[PDB]
Ligand SMILES: CC(C)N1CCC(NC(=O)c2cc3ccccc3n2Cc2cc(-c3ccc(Cl)s3)on2)CC1
């Protein structure tokens with residue numbers, strides 16, 4: 315996360331972190347329930363083998379509330395393409411259930427129609443993660459969060475050098491130096507409504523980080539709700 | 549702004565217009581309250597809530 319603030323105690327409890335064999339975080343994820351984690355499909359290619367850490371806010375210190383979980387099943391969307399990053403979505407089934415507590419809790423999955431007309435028409439959403447604090451910087455050791463404005467779909471397409479499919483949406487600022495970044499991918503994009511947070515997106519990609527005239531590109535969760543339910547049912 | 553377009557139909561969460569008139573519902577882990585608008589947590593750590601303890 316470039317800019318923004320660090321997540322305070324209990325503020326981003328649905329945050330999950332995918333870690334490689336050497337215990338390094340490379341992607342984010344969103345806790346959907348005790349057994350399921352939502353992340354990006356392209357993240358599945360960053361590591362041949364990985365696990366999921368929850369309840370983590372500071373990667374270099376322990377506050378016995380963190381927990382590592384092995385992945386039992388990786389459910390990737392069969393239509394994902396590295397060419398355009400379309401269908402950048404995946405669901406992870408954990409071997410053991412997540413025990414909810416302080417800093418560990420699931421985000422809510424909304425209904426499509428309501429989410430699209432009410433949630434995505436709100437002024438802002440919230441993205442978070444352990445990603446780079448600057449485009450060329452290194453990974454953050456502190457979990458961060460950033461309020462990102464929803465970006466008009468037209469302006470989104472006009473600003474991108476890459477095709478923006480119906481499974482993606484823009485969020486962020488035109489020139490202000492705040493945006494998600496490398497490391498935050500697969501992470502949560504949630505929208506607050508009456509103090510309840512709903513999953514509205516998955517950190518997908520961007521042309522650099524916080525670049526002027528460019529926005530953050532997220533997978534449009536509302537387009538995969540039925541798919542997500544299917545994946546969790548099985 | 550008439551039904552769900554007017555202040556979310558006074559619903560805490562999901563709002564849908566069925567044969568005119570507002571109908572509220574909630575996410576898994578919540579139950580619609582008696583006023584048929586508010587959503588009450590079924591148990592501890594309901595989804596979408598920042599942990600206060
Ligand atoms: C053609 C499509 C398929 N393609 C997908 C990958 C895109 N490249 C990146 O992704 C990327 C570019 C890039 C440049 C400097 C530093 C980090 C970078 N990342 C990695 C990166 C940057 C981010 C985000 C920035 C804002 C967000 Cl929201 S996610 O997350 N990971 C380029 C366009």
Ligand SMILES: [Ca+2]
Nearest residue numbers: 371372375376
């Ligand atoms: Ca820690």
